[PDB]
Amino acid sequence: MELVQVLRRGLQQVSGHGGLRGYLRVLFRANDVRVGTLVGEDKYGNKYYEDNKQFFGRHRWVIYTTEMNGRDTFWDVDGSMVPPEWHRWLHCMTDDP
Amino acid sequence: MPLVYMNIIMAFAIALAGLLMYRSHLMSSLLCLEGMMLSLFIMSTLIILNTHFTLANMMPIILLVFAACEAALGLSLLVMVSNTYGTDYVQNLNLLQC
Amino acid sequence: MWFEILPGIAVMAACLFIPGMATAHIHKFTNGGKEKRVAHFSYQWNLMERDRCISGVNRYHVTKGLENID
Amino acid sequence: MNIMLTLLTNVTLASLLVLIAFWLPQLNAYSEKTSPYECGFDPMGSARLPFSMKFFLVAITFLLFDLEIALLLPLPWASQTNNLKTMLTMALFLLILLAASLAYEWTQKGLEWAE
Amino acid sequence: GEFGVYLVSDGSSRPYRCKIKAPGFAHLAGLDKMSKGHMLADVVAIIGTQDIVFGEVDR
Amino acid sequence: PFFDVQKRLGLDLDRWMTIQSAEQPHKIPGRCHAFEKEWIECAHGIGGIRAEKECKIEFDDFVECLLRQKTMKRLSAIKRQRDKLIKEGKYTPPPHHLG
Amino acid sequence: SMMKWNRERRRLQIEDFEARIALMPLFQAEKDRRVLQMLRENLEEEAIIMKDVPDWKVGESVFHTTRWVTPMMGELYGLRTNEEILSATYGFIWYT
Amino acid sequence: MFMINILSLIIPILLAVAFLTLVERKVLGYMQLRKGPNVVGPYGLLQPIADALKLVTKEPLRPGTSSISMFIIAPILGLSLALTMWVPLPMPYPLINMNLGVLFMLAMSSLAVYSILWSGWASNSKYALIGALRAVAQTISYEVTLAIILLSVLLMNGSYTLSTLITTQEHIWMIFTSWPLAMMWFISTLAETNRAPFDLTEGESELVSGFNVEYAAGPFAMFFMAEYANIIMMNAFTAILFLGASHDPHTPELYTINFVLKTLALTITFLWIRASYPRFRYDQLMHLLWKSFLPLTLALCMWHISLPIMTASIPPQS
Amino acid sequence: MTMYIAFILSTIFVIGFVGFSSKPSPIYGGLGLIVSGGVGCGIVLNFGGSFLGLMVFLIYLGGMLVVFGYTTAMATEMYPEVWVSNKTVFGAFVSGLMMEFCMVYYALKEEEVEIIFKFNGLGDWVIYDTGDSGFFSEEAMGIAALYSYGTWLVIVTGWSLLIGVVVIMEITRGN
Amino acid sequence: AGRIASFLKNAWAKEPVLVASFAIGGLAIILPSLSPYTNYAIRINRATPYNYPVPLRDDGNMPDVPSHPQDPQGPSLEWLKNL
Amino acid sequence: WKPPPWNDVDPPKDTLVSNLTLNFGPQHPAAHGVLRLVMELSGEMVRKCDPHIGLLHRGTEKLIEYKTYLQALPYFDRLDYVSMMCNEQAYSLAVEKLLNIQPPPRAQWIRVLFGEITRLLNHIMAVTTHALDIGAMTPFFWMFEEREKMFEFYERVSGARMHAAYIRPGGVHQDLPLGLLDDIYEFSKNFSFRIDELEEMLTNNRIWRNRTVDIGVVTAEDALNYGFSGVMLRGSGIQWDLRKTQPYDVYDQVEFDVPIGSRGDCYDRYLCRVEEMRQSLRII
Amino acid sequence: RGEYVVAKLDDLVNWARRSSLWPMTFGLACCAVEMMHMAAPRYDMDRFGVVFRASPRQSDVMIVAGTLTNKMAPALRKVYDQMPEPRYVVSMGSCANGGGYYHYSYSVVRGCDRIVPVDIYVPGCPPTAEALLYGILQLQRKIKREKRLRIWYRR
Ligand SMILES: COC1=C(OC)C(=O)C(C/C=C(/C)CC/C=C(/C)CC/C=C(\C)CC/C=C(\C)CC/C=C(/C)CC/C=C(\C)CC/C=C(/C)CC/C=C(\C)CC/C=C(\C)CCC=C(C)C)=C(C)C1=O
Ligand code: SF4
Q: Name one Pfam family in it (chain F) (predicted).
């Protein structure tokens, strides 16, 4: 039944990301559809997800904001939009968000 | 005689004109050597298909098998034309004029 | 996660499927529903002409049964 | 009818592909861009001098090999004869001879590269 | 290989001469001796086994 | 042959193909088997010199069968005639030649 | 497995060919009438073509021999519709 | 409507050739602990189109020393053969049913080399001539057995028609009867397309790009389709040759689905082989085939002519 | 029109035949021969010789392939010839293309002709014959008779290729 | 004996390809004669009719050939139907 | 005119040799960027190869004259940029020798420990890129993920991935972070389960064997005379290794084997490098 | 308006270029080895659309990565001239950004820009395989923001 387990696991992915519209957003804009846990949200609008059960390197990730300092940060995003205080936690420099 | 037999026959005619009327390349000459095989092969295939000569239908390939044999040994004459004279142009081989 | 490979070959699977699908249906459509006739020998080709001549509409894939004859 | 229609359609589509390829992209040629590529530095200068390759002997033999592959191609129709005893003997002759020609070609160096 | 340095010091706070024995320097001089009769594709193979990086040899 | 051995030792090496009226695979007749049958048994053992005059009016009938020389001349003459009154417009082909 | 299947295919080929030869007499019985009909229409029309000709005997056998030959297809489909002759000669060879 | 059929056999293939590039990138990557293209659209499904526009709007480089007329004929000749050599394939019902299908298969396959030949000459460079002549050396060893394996396998099919291949393979796969030949055919089909262990003609690490060195934009883009359309078509040739699926006389869907899946499985193995093994040397390639392959072909062809007569299992001709 | 399609296919056979017989650069002549060979396949394919057309196509591609390898190996010049560059081949080129032009006009215009032989231009379609082949192709079945009727031809041919490899090694031995 | 077996073993070790080709190539020449179906193979080829069995005129004294393609007399091939 | 030669052999023609001259670089992927190999070759076999170098001649030995000993350390870091810790180890030992000063016992051990994972790095680079240059691309990527992990250990202890500038005269710059050694143990457990994986891919592969067996063979005396060292000596049979014969640091207190080849060709060195991988794992 | 269709064709063309730019196989020194780690499975440059094609006739962005010296500077500019249009050159690492460590030596050109029109400058000695991973993506944004046809329709 592992086949249907991974089938329903993918179904919890689409429901977890706020329905189909949210699923398509993260697929088209974030390129990954894994769900995690909201460990914090910075003042600029970047959600910070984290999942301990993960291959080291993918256990912490950021969903970038839709607006930052005027410029539109829909699909075009970069790596410098990470505020410093979260840059430490994101780059595994510490285990304290 | 139809134009198909005509134009094929005329084709071998300038194949001869190409063959013996020479130029400064032995390769291009032996190119015309296997070229005139085309006309004879195509010519011969036309009749025996036209005449329903079932037995003679193997004569083209038998002719065509021997065809590249001339080219085969022809190319090997070229290489030691090159091995001993470097080039291919047909003027350096004249030491046998004497 | 190797599933991502499948979408690539998935559209490809349809891509090679269209030709064989097209030819079979085009042959089925043009040749009066019946599968396209094969003429690998003069006997088949001679047979095809007889069908075309007796068809009247100059179409090989129009077969008239016993109702044609008396 | 169908065969040359198929042939004509294919060359046409190819011609358009190279046509839009060779015309559309807003060319800009400045000589050194068109200069021959020589792995970063200038060419020594030739590329039409006679590139003496060493498989010349194996080259002509391939021609002789093909001449007899045409001979042994009518076998599918030759098997549908009334004299298989003769057809089998003559057929096996060609392969025996083809192996024999290769065997001499092999044993007396031949196949080996020229160094 | 046998990476080595020849350090000559005058006695001041800075070196006077620093020759850098690069293991690939001696190796690469032997490329011709190796590739004798081998084809070019072999030369590509001979380069790889030699394990040369050109920071050390060009110094 | 110059030195006839095919006859001497009694084995056929090339006679089987020499003519188109000889036996063919699965009895596929030639285009002019009837003519080559008649021509061959006309001048057989009579003499090459005593052949070109007597087995003549039968030989060209065969040579016409291969090439259709004066037969194609007939068609060219008829088709030439078509062009010279169709343009002049005296005659129209019957519906058999249209459909 | 192949050796059984191939022999079964052979069994069908004789069965296919037997149906061919049984039907063959009718096919030969149609062909002669069509070619004779085709030869007639050319020759009946040949009288109209060769009425004003200065010297052209109608219905002259090009060969000296009086035995019938297999009629040459060029005069069979000589003046027929250009499409018809085109399909007649290069039909099979082009059919696909 | 025959013209509609022609495009229906060209455009659907062309997208199939396009997506092979994306599939190969992902298959190679996932066999590499990598991920492959996944940013251009979803799952990287837009990647071939992204490369499609770039190449045809890329600056098409004309080298000054190149012979221009021969420069342009080669990309045309390469692509034209690739598409037209799809037409006799018996996808349920072949588009062009000819009594000599496999002979026509070999003819344009042999004609294909003149693309890399004339292009290699016309480029007028060292790497151009090196690639073109080793392309001769690679392909010169190649037709001699390719014909023999084709002859030996087909000798018990009955004739050279591709349609009757299905009737022969109706009961069991052809590979069960000629697996020694199938492995040898598969290596050569892996080889005729200049792929995986035999890619001397390209030779990225040793000839930079070989014949393709002076070929950019569409002239390059054309060269990629000819190489990749030949990959799919040759595997499809092998699929019918050795793994002929069942064919329901009333539902061509059944054969089409099965046949396509066989081509996909074989084409993946082409990428499978391409990832795993190293690259041969063009002398070893020739030595591999004319010293080890060719001797086995003659005896195996010897076996496959004697076998039908000895077993009274000759196939019908018609 | 396609009615004289064979009339056409015969021509470009000879224009290609002329082009390479004008002795251009050796590989250019190789192209000049293959176009003629490719179209030459068409003429015999039109008449019914399907196997003959494919084989003259197949092995002459193989034959011309090995020719190209030798041309660039030891038969090419640092300044290659073209059909236009040298005036000699240019003169040979232009002479060939008007030779056919003036003649096929004359043959088509008069349709009787005299040169060497007599030729009724009319149409090559004419000489096709009202024949049926049954369930066998004559062009393929006759060739299949090579292994049942032409045993002597097989022996002489097969033998000759064997020395063909002997001579190809005998004369290349280089001492 | 020992030398011959060793030479085969030395071959089979040094080269497995030509020995395999020589072996299976060698068989392809011999068993065609020993096969008991080769006489059947020619019979199958002879049985398959490509041309018409043209009828022949009656003059009496011809019991072998039938007068109808259903009569018991004549060449029959039930051997091939079971084969 | 002239009578024909009376022995019937014409005078031999003057040489018409036209060997190709090819520069394998400095852009070829196998040229590794800065290798200008002008080789005289006829057809596809080389006759003489002139290896023009200098396409990367930074005046390193000239600039060191103008910098203090501490400032000269990053030079060696950049010297052989795939064996960084081993490079600084050479320079540091020389300066310590001249200063007549020894490093503390803990320093020497991590210099050996980090000098050995450096041997892991270079041998990964050598064997993988070898297969990459040969044509085997897959073995390249699998280790490069693993040797990426080792770069993490580099940065965790020094700060930068490649150029640690960590091994200094008189000892290392600063102690390792807590938990670094445990991370070493986790990786070393996994590694031997990948080294054999490489051997599964190439070592017994016939195509890799033919491309590498009995090719580029160098004898014993000429290799010794040519100034060769390292694998060039151990590959051809000469049982020489500085870690054993003249052990620096604490290499004496570590047991390990030195793989020695017999044929001396290209292939024997590939096993010698791969076996050096596993022997390094014992040192770690 | 013609501006709308020009902008739509504008977005179509550059998106093809930024999602399919092929970095050349042009490595020099220490700065090149870690760039392999970008192509290594850890970061997987190919996932972002790029492929590492050799043969500057078939490449878009030139990764000048390592010390640019005197003896090779002619070779690079010949290589750059061979690259078709459009072509970009990312100066990668401090050595190619002005001379790096050996800025003051005798056989190094102080900066890759003195030979080539150098695009976005990625610093580092070496820049981390990720550091210029942004460098490549930041160029993809530069390709996104171009006008080209917009200028042409307004030229
Ligand atoms: C010296 O320094 C070096 C570096 O750094 C400086 C490096 O980093 C690295 C490390 C990096 C690596 C990636 C390692 C491998 C790299 C090497 C150089 C090593 C040598 C390489 C090899 C031996 C293998 C080479 C393999 C290649 C090139 C892969 C080829 C196959 C592919 C599938 C990928 C390419 C795919 C492409 C281009 C996409 C498809 C192509 C198209 C043209 C697009 C489609 C186009 C169309 C459909 C046409 C348009 C038509 C349409 C749309 C149809 C509709 C319209 C109509 C009009 C019909 C190395 C090794 C190095 O040595
Ligand atoms: S910038 Fe630093 S890492 Fe890059 S090549 Fe120069 S010294 Fe080496």
A: Ndufs5
